[PDB]
Structures are given as structure tokens and as C-alpha cells.
């Protein structure tokens, strides 16, 4: 039945909250994350809104391949963060180790920039998620993650139903980083709570499996739906569902 | 009879000046403002260039929805601290008054995103307008805001002359910006003043809606006027008379 | 003879120079500059390109008006301290004299902006000229200087010439801004010689003179010379004369 | 015969290095570089794509001189440090020799700004390109550079290819930026490792002009290949060959 068929985006929701969590751990091994206050999910949207500016003044100011540089370094770099704390909480400090984790980076970018195999693509994609994931996760603890997941919900319905309503006024009346992107979102949180086999925390990746349950459901039938708001409301409430519990 | 058309402005008049009030007092609970030095006023005028400056290279590097994103963003935070300030008078800095300020907020712009009812517009206009008025007022006392005022309103008829020769020549010889936001500008006096049932600054209110009057007499006459001189002229004209009172 | 015509120009340099000394004075009475160090042409000279950038990026973000926005500020400052250093010495910090200042300032732009006689123009392009004139001047002294006004002055000879060509090969082989700011240029040396009736740099100013004749003789031939060089060489020239004196 | 054409280039390799070596010496006498951690080679390509990005602003805010005005500013200083070094280290700290340079290098760029006679041009890359070199040869040690150059050809090989393919795909199925900038890239390794009758690094030397040679075949049959690897492959060839030398 339809069990191989549209379960492969779950499959990678399972697969980058489980990378996340491995990830969880080496990190402390040089600090990172950036106390948990609830001013700081706004540090995030201010930092991201200038983060995309930057982005989008980048492709507005490309550069054939300079815009194809500037993002090679980005993801080379945080290859390197990934594969660095791998190895280098691994084998430790080891010239083996640290030469290891350069070698891994330039490996995987270069396969992915030399046209790879583009199921390989979404297997780059869990990783990198989970990466992000992972360090927002060990940064500031639930409340704020909180009140962060329930704004950007909040703004997405919002532009949804805008330009849904400028879709029915029309007449009369690459996605991938906005993706896998939303695949982290709820994620950030389920780190962000074991940071504070598992805790009963396994309610929010299951609440949120939920989310993209519904999600995938309703999007498949015709005149389309919000997109956090299933998978954050979801998360969170498998979460709370998990608070009950212990 | 002519009541209830264009007496709205006024009334908006009004609200914005007791609202900015009202915010003088929650608002030392956390300071803000920002020395009654009359550099004050050209620190203002150059940081509002360099901000809209900033507000264009946003408008030009917008931005599909981008844009919006990022002033409904300042406009999120700004009610965060009008509600914030609220709150935080009231019950005091107990986390049941700041959780009651966010939600707040995000009531308030996530309706006003939904297009609301739209008299409700004039009504958040209101708001904020009377937010920033309450701050600046805050900043710093009057001298310094006499030398502002009357700074603005000359730049201001002094372009209006210039583009309006610039009409007469050419033949062979968003707005609410603008609005709410002079709407605010001659309060700013009111409030530094009752800082510097009140003040005999009562007549730097009136005098102002004197200024309104005036100002919309003339537009509703044919070939319309300047706009901040018969405001700030006649803000100042009264407050000035509060001197004669006490 | 041919007194009366084109003589106003030089009638400027002298003008300039003059009110660039009277300008020598006030403004010791607040320090300013900005350490006789050569390094300081070069500070000069970047910050000219970024000023230059900024101007331009706002010229192309104009801002109908917001560009004469933006340089109403710029000059209304200019003419603040222009004014601000001249009654501030004289009455001194009295309010008097500060609002003296403001007051001036303000007749003075306001003036220049309501279509004035013009004539004007080139008044307060004198005197706006004469007040960097000597702000730059006594900022450091003159060795620096010295290789200011050569490393301009050769900037010039190379634009002119590489444009000169550019127009010769063509075949088959607001201007007052760059114009008073050039009229500056060679009277700063003036300043920062006498802050190292008058000193022997009477001298530079009597070569400056000369080197405007030399200017306004070629200028007045077919096919132009540079502008600085005989300028900046002349003053320069005249200044080394005023050495053999004393 | 065939001995004075097209053997220029690995002339001006061969002297490059030279000139780098040379300039080795006097730029300690002000320090400059810029600890062996590998941490610095991505902290200078962080840089460079920083840097193209500031070059490719300046060249979209043109600016009909403006920018020659930025570029030909920038190469006067860079020529200011190249005498600078070069006298500084000859007649040492005098004023004899520090005016020495600063005239030396008004001299080059006002030249190089009229139009030489172009055997000079590859006679001015040549001076800036050893100068680099020699720089970054001081700035951090071998295995940091091994880094860097491994990295480089790679991005160079990869991006190349790519293209490449968007060539073979459109059917069915300003350079000497790059280009003497390329020239410098395997001589900071030769530099950088006599900062570890010469070194076994001559090897690295003639190592660069096999990877030169290997170059120059391909690139003359029809079809190019990518550039850098082989430059710096041959380079690290005989220079990782002058280890079992010593």
C-alpha cells in the first residue's frame, strides 16, 4: 500500500531530530549554542532577517559563480563544524582526527557540487538540518524555543492565508532551503529539552511526526494548507503530551 | 449633521496625545527616552535619515514578501513594548504580566495582518502613534523640543513650496506614514512638558488642535496648504500661553 | 581692460581665504582637526571616496526630495558650526549667542532654499567653502598637506588627461560641488602654515593667485588643461617663495 | 629559432618568486603576515569573497571615474608599502628613503595609469604579484598554506567543470584579476617554507613550473582544462619532493 510512497519526508524528520540529538553531544566539547531568556528568540528572527538580506543582496550582486562561491564557503564551513566535532571529539585533538574531519568536508561538498547522485542530496539536506538543529537546540532552553516556534508559526499562517487571498483576488474577488529548513524548526526544540533511550521528549518528535502527518494529508488534497502551524502546534503538543507523563 | 465625517482626525488627535500620557507614566518602570541638550534634536534628524535611508535599500531590495516581513517584525517588537510597558505597570514585573504582553501583541499585529475592520486601523494608528509620542516626550525637555518642532515644520512648508513652484512650472511658466506619524509630532511637546487635571500645557494641546483646525479648513478649501507650521506653530502658540497660566 | 569680467573667480579665492583665517580663530575655541602625521592625507582621502559613495548610493536611492533631504542636514550642520563657532566666540556660551547660531543657521539655508537672489550662491558657496577651508587647516600641519595637495593634484592631471583622450579616440583614432570644493582645495595649505599682516604664506596666497591665472589663461584656450596642478602648483609655488622671506 | 616568443611566462613566474623572495626581507622590518593554525586559511577566503563582494559594489555603484578613482587609490598604496619595504630596508628609516618610496610609487601608478607600454604592465603585475606573495608567504606557515592551495585548485577544478558542463548542455545534449593574481597562489607556499645555496624548496619552484608546463599542454590543445591543479599539484609535487633531501 502507500507505505514507500510519501513517507520518505518523515523518514527524514525522524532521521534529522535522531542526527540532532547525536549531535547534541559533541558540541559542548568547544562551548557554542547563543542563557535562557525569552529575548532570545528574537535575537534569532533579527539575525535571520539580516541573514537573508545579506543572502539576497549576494544573488542580487551575483557573480556567475561568486554567488556559487560565497555559498560553497558558507556550507564548507559548516561541513567542517559538523565533521570537526565528529572527529575531533572522536579520536580528540588528533592531527588524525582535525585532518579527518577537513578531508570529510571536502569530500562531502565536492560530491555535492559535482552533481552527485541527488538522493545523496537529501541525505546532505538531513544532515546539514540536523546540524543547525542541533546548535540552536543546545542553545536557550524550551520557553524561549517556545515562544520562537509559536511566532514563527504564527507569521507563516499569516503569509499563507495572504497570498492564498491574493490567489482568489487575482481573478475577481531551491524550495529546498525553505524546507528542509522548515524540517529543523520543530527540531530545534526537540533538543532544546533534552538539553534541559530519551526523556519524555520522544512526545514532542512524535507530535510532531503527527504534524507532518496532518500536513502531508491535507496538502495532498486540493487548496493547500498553512505549514508550521501543523508541525509546531503538533510538536508542541505531543510535547505537552510528554509533561503529563513526567 | 457634518459631525461624524472629518471629525475622526481630531478625535485621533486627541487619543494619540492622552494615549502618549498615559505610556509617560508605565514607561520609567523601564526608563527609555534618549540630557536636555538641544543636540539631541540633530542626533534625532540624523539618526531618522540614516533610518529610512535603511527603510529604501529595504524597499529597493525587496523583497517579494520580504519587506513585510521585516517592518510587521519592528512593528511586533514596538507592541511588545507598548504592551510590555502596560503590563509591567500594572501587576508589575510578575511573568504573568510579560506572558500577558506578548500575547498581546501578538493579538494585535497578527489582526491587524488579517485585515481587521479597518476603523481599527485608525485605532492602532492611534497607538503607536501615541507610543512613540509618550518616548520622545520622555526624551529630552522642551528647549531642545522647541528647537525640533520648529525645525520640522519649516522643512516641511519650506518643500511643500518647492515642489508645489515645481507644479506651477511644469506647465510653461504608505500615506499613513506621513500621517500618523505628524499626527504624533506636535504631542511630542505636549508630553516634555508635563514632564519638563494637568499641566498649563493643556495649551500646548489645544494650540496644536488649532493647528488641525487650520490646517483642515484650508484643505477643505480649494488649493490646499502646508501641513506641520499650523500644527507645531499652534502647538507651541498654546504652550507658550501656558506660560502666562502658571 | 577686462577687469570687471572674470575676475569674480579669483575675487572668491582671496574671499575664501580671507574668511578661512577669520575661521582660523573661533574654532581653536572647541579644538577640532582630525598629530602632524603624513599618514593623515591618506585618512582624508579614504574617508573622500567613502563620502563620495554615500553621497552617490543616496543619489541613485533617491528620495525625490530625501536626497535634498539628506543634504539639507549635511549643510544645516555645516552652517551650525559655521555660525555656532562664530557667535560662540563671541558672546560666548551665552544663549544668546547660541540661539544667535541656530536662528543664523536657519535664515541662512532656509534662504538658499526659497529660491534666493543667487548671487548668494556664491556667498555662502564661499563661505561653506572657507568653513571646511579651515577645519581641514588646522588639522595637520603642512608636510602632510604638502603631499595632499601634490597626490590631488595629480589625480587630476591623470582624469583630465585619460578623458582628453577618451574624447580623441572617439573619433577614429552640480558642477559647483567638485568647483568650490576645488576652490578649497589649494587654500587649506593656506591655513595649515599659518597654524604652523600676515605670515609669509602671504606667499602661498599670492601663488594660488597666480596659479589661477595660469588656469583661467589655458581654460580660455582651446582644448582645457587639468585644474588643480596649476593651482596646487601655483599656491604651493608662491608658498616656497614666502620660505626665502623668512 | 623559437627561443624570444612565448617564453615569457614562466619567466615571469620564475621572477615573480624572485621578487617575493627579495621582498621577503624587508617587510619583517615592520612585521606585517597574518600563529601556523589552519584556522587562518578559512578566516582568508572568508576575506576574499568579502573583499570580491566590496570590488563587485564598487563596481555596481559606478561612477564614471569613481571607480578607476577607488582601484587606482588602492594600488598606490599597495605600491607605497612595496617601496616603503624596498627602502626601509635599504637607506633604513631616514627621510631619504621614506620620501624615496612614497615618490617611487606616485611614480609607478601614474604610469601604470597612462597607458604604459604593456611589456611594463607584465613588469607592474609582476611587482605586485611577488609583493603579495611575499605577504601571505610571511603570513602563516606551510600546513596552513598546504590547506589553503589544496583547497583552491579544488574550488578551481570543480567550478571549471562545472561551467564546463553548462556549455555541453546549452546545445542538446578585467581577466588579469585572475590571472596574475593565479600567478602569485603557488609562490606564497614557496614563500612560506623559507619562513619555516637555498631551501629544498626550489623544488617547490621548479615543481610550480612543471605544474605550469602541464598547464601550458593542456590548455593549448582544444577543449581547456581547469588551471590551479595543476600549478599547485606541481608546485606541492617538488616541494614535498624536497623532503627526502632534507
Given at each position: 500500500?502507500?507505505?514507500?510512497?510519501?513517507?520518505?519526508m518523515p523518514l527524514m524528520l525522524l532521521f534529522v531530530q535522531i542526527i540532532a540529538?547525536?549531535?547534541?553531544?559533541?558540541?559542548?566539547?568547544?562551548?557554542?549554542?547563543?542563557?535562557?531568556?525569552?529575548?532570545?528568540?528574537?535575537?534569532?528572527?533579527?539575525?535571520?532577517?539580516?541573514?537573508?538580506?545579506?543572502?539576497?543582496?549576494?544573488?542580487?550582486?551575483?557573480?556567475?559563480?561568486?554567488?556559487?562561491?560565497?555559498?560553497?564557503?558558507?556550507?564548507?564551513?559548516?561541513?567542517?563544524?559538523?565533521?570537526?566535532?565528529?572527529?575531533?571529539?572522536?579520536?580528540?585533538?588528533?592531527?588524525?582526527?582535525?585532518?579527518?574531519?577537513?578531508?570529510?568536508?571536502?569530500?562531502?561538498?565536492?560530491?555535492?557540487?559535482?552533481?552527485?547522485?541527488?538522493?545523496?542530496?537529501?541525505?546532505?539536506?538531513?544532515?546539514?538540518?540536523?546540524?543547525?538543529?542541533?546548535?540552536?537546540?543546545?542553545?536557550?532552553?524550551?520557553?524561549p524555543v517556545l515562544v520562537l516556534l509559536?511566532?514563527?508559526?504564527?507569521?507563516?499562517?499569516?503569509?499563507?492565508?495572504?497570498?492564498?487571498?491574493?490567489?482568489?483576488?487575482?481573478?475577481?474577488?531551491?524550495?529546498?532551503?525553505?524546507?528542509?529548513?522548515?524540517?529543523?524548526?520543530?527540531?530545534?526544540?526537540?533538543?532544546?529539552?533534552?538539553?534541559?533511550?530519551?526523556?519524555?521528549?520522544?512526545?514532542?518528535?512524535?507530535?510532531?511526526?503527527?504534524?507532518?502527518?496532518?500536513?502531508?494529508?491535507?496538502?495532498?488534497?486540493?487548496?493547500?494548507?498553512?505549514?508550521?502551524?501543523?508541525?509546531?502546534?503538533?510538536?508542541?503538543?505531543?510535547?505537552?503530551?510528554?509533561?503529563?507523563?513526567?
Amino acid at each position: 500500500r502507500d507505505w514507500l510512497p510519501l513517507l520518505g519526508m518523515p523518514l527524514m524528520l525522524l532521521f534529522v531530530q535522531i542526527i540532532a540529538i547525536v549531535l547534541v553531544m559533541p558540541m559542548q566539547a568547544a562551548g557554542l549554542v547563543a542563557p535562557s531568556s525569552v529575548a532570545n528568540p528574537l535575537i534569532f528572527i533579527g539575525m535571520l532577517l539580516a541573514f537573508t538580506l545579506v543572502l539576497l543582496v549576494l544573488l542580487r550582486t551575483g557573480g556567475r559563480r561568486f554567488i556559487a562561491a560565497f555559498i560553497g564557503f558558507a556550507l564548507f564551513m559548516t561541513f567542517l563544524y559538523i565533521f570537526g566535532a565528529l572527529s575531533l571529539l572522536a579520536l580528540g585533538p588528533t592531527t588524525a582526527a582535525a585532518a579527518g574531519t577537513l578531508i570529510g568536508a571536502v569530500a562531502v561538498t565536492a560530491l555535492l557540487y559535482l552533481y552527485p547522485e541527488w538522493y545523496v542530496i537529501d541525505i546532505l539536506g538531513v544532515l546539514i538540518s540536523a546540524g543547525v538543529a542541533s546548535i540552536f537546540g543546545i542553545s536557550l532552553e524550551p520557553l524561549p524555543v517556545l515562544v520562537l516556534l509559536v511566532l514563527l508559526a504564527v507569521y507563516d499562517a499569516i503569509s499563507v492565508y495572504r497570498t492564498k487571498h491574493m490567489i482568489t483576488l487575482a481573478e475577481g474577488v531551491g524550495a529546498f532551503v525553505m524546507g528542509m529548513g522548515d524540517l529543523i524548526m520543530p527540531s530545534i526544540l526537540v533538543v532544546s529539552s533534552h538539553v534541559f533511550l530519551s526523556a519524555p521528549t520522544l512526545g514532542a518528535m512524535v507530535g510532531s511526526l503527527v504534524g507532518l502527518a496532518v500536513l502531508l494529508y491535507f496538502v495532498n488534497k486540493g487548496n493547500p494548507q498553512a505549514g508550521l502551524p501543523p508541525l509546531n502546534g503538533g510538536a508542541i503538543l505531543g510535547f505537552l503530551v510528554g509533561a503529563a507523563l513526567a
